[PDB]
C-alpha cells in the first residue's frame, strides 16, 4: 500500500506519498495535478527496487497553502523540496527526479539551483527554459496568444477563481484533464472554457471517474494555490538573471507527446530539435516524442513512461 504522511518542512506541512525501498525517485507533479497523478509510476517503480516519493506541492491537495501569492515563486517550491529531501532522505547524497508540467519547471530549477542533489532527471512535457533578457515571458505569451490565453487569464487575482466557481470544480478538472488540442488553451473572459453549459465531457480510457473524484475532492478547497505558480512567472524571470547562460549539469531524459500544447509554444520545437536544448543541457541523453499522445503523458501512457523512467535510471546504478 502507498504510505501517506504529513511532514513539517521549515514550517510548511507537506503531504508526502511514498512507496518502496532503494534509490529515491522524487516525483514532482504539475497543474492541476497532485501526488495522485504519479500513482501508477509510484507502483511501477516501487516494485522495481526504487523508493518512490511524490509530494503534494505547496498549495496543492493536503499540503499547506500559504495565503499570499508572493509565497509561490520557484525559490519557495524548490526550498520546500530541498527541506523535504533533508527530512525524509537525509542520508542520501543525490536522488532521482521526475517532473511533469509545472513540476518539470520546478525540476529544472531544482537542477539549476542544486545540481549537487540530483543524480539524474526525467522531465515530461516542459523543456528547459533558458533565461532570456530580451522579454518577460508573460509579455511574449500575450503578444502571441492574447488576453484570453489561460496563463494571462490566471494573472489577475480572484477572476479565474470566480469563473471556476461558476463552472464547478468537477467540470474544471475534466476540462483540464481531457484537453487534447496541440495549441493554446483559451479561456474567454467571463465564459470559462467557452463551452456550452451542461455539455457532455467524455473521459478517455486512461482517466477514470475515480481519478476525477480524487482530483475534485481536493480542488474543491480551491485552485488559487496552483494558479499562483503562473502568477509568479514574471517574478521568477525577474529573480533568475543570475543564471543567464547557465547549463544544466545533470543527465536528462526528456519525453513529450506530439499533441501536447506545451510542445507548440513559441520556439519550443526548434529549441528542442535544432540544438539549443542540447547546448543548454549538455548531458541531455535522448529526446522522445510520442506520437498521438497529449499533455498528461504520465497518465495517458503510464506503463511506457514508467518503463522509460526505469530504463534511464538503471544506467546510473
Q: Where are the domains of the chain?
A: 3-316
Any long-range contacts for 152-158 (C-beta under 8 Å, 24+ apart)?
153/187, 153/189, 154/227, 154/230, 154/231, 155/230, 155/231, 157/69, 157/231
Q: How far apart are CA 279 and CA 110, in angstroms?
A: 19
Resolution (A): 2.4
Residue 2 burial by CB count (10 A; 0-12/13-18/19+): exposed, middle or buried?
A: middle
C-alpha cell at 190: 467571463
Whether the Cβ atoms of residue 9 and residue 192 lie closer than 8 Å to each other = no
Please answer whether residues 185 and 150 qualify as being in contact, where contact means their C-beta atoms are separated by less than 8 angstroms: yes
Backbone dihedral region for residue 142 (phi beyond 0: left; psi -120 to 50: alpha; all else: beta): alpha
Rounded to whole angstroms, how far apart are CA atoms 146 and 152? 8
Which experiment gave this structure?
X-ray
Give catalytic residue positions: 101, 230, 295
| Sign of the dihedral defined by the CA atoms of residues 316, 21, 63, 296, in that order | positive
Alpha carbon distance 256, 261 (integer Å): 10
Q: 144: which DSSP letter?
A: H
Could you confirm whether domain 3-316 is CATH 3.40.50.1820?
Answer: yes
CB 197 within 8 A of CB 37: no
Chain mean position to CA 265: 16
Return left, alpha or beta for 222; rule: phi > 0 is left, psi -120 to 50 is alpha, else beta. Answer: left
Please identify which residue in the block is written with the cell numbers 519547471.
105
Nearest-5° Cα angle at 13, 7 to 15: 65
Amino acid at each position: 500500500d502507498i504510505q501517506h504522511r504529513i511532514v513539517n518542512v521549515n514550517g510548511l506541512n507537506m503531504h508526502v506519498a511514498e512507496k518502496g525501498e532503494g534509490p529515491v525517485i522524487l516525483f514532482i507533479h504539475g497543474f492541476p495535478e497532485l501526488w495522485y497523478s504519479w500513482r501508477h509510476q509510484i507502483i511501477a517503480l516501487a516494485s522495481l527496487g526504487y523508493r518512490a516519493i511524490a509530494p503534494d506541492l505547496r498549495g496543492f491537495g493536503d499540503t499547506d497553502a500559504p495565503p499570499s501569492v508572493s509565497s509561490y515563486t520557484c525559490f519557495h517550491v524548490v526550498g520546500d523540496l530541498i527541506g523535504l529531501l533533508d527530512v525524509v532522505a537525509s542520508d542520501r547524497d543525490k536522488v532521482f527526479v521526475v517532473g511533469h508540467d509545472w513540476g518539470a519547471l520546478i525540476a529544472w530549477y531544482l537542477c539549476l539551483f542544486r545540481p549537487d542533489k540530483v543524480k539524474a532527471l526525467v522531465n515530461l512535457s516542459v523543456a528547459f527554459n533558458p533565461w532570456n533578457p530580451k522579454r518577460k515571458p508573460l509579455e511574449g505569451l500575450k503578444a502571441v496568444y492574447g488576453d484570453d490565453y489561460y496563463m494571462i487569464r490566471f494573472q489577475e487575482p480572484g477572476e479565474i477563481e470566480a469563473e471556476f466557481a461558476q463552472i464547478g470544480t468537477e467540470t474544471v478538472v475534466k476540462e483540464f484533464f481531457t484537453y487534447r488540442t496541440p495549441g493554446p488553451l483559451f479561456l474567454p473572459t467571463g465564459k470559462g472554457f467557452g463551452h456550452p453549459p451542461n455539455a457532455e465531457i467524455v473521459l478517455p480510457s486512461w482517466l477514470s471517474e475515480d481519478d476525477v473524484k480524487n482530483y475534485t475532492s481536493k480542488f474543491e478547497k480551491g485552485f488559487t494555490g496552483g494558479v499562483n505558480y503562473y502568477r509568479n512567472i514574471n517574478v521568477n524571470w525577474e529573480l533568475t538573471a543570475p543564471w543567464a547562460g547557465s547549463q544544466i549539469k545533470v543527465p536528462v531524459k526528456f519525453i513529450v507527446g506530439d499533441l501536447d500544447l506545451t510542445y507548440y509554444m513559441p520556439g519550443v520545437k526548434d529549441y528542442i530539435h535544432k540544438g539549443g536544448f542540447k547546448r543548454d543541457v549538455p548531458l541531455l541523453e535522448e529526446v522522445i516524442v510520442m506520437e498521438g499522445v497529449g499533455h498528461f503523458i504520465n497518465g495517458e501512457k503510464a506503463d511506457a513512461i514508467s518503463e522509460h523512467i526505469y530504463n534511464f535510471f538503471q544506467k546510473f546504478k
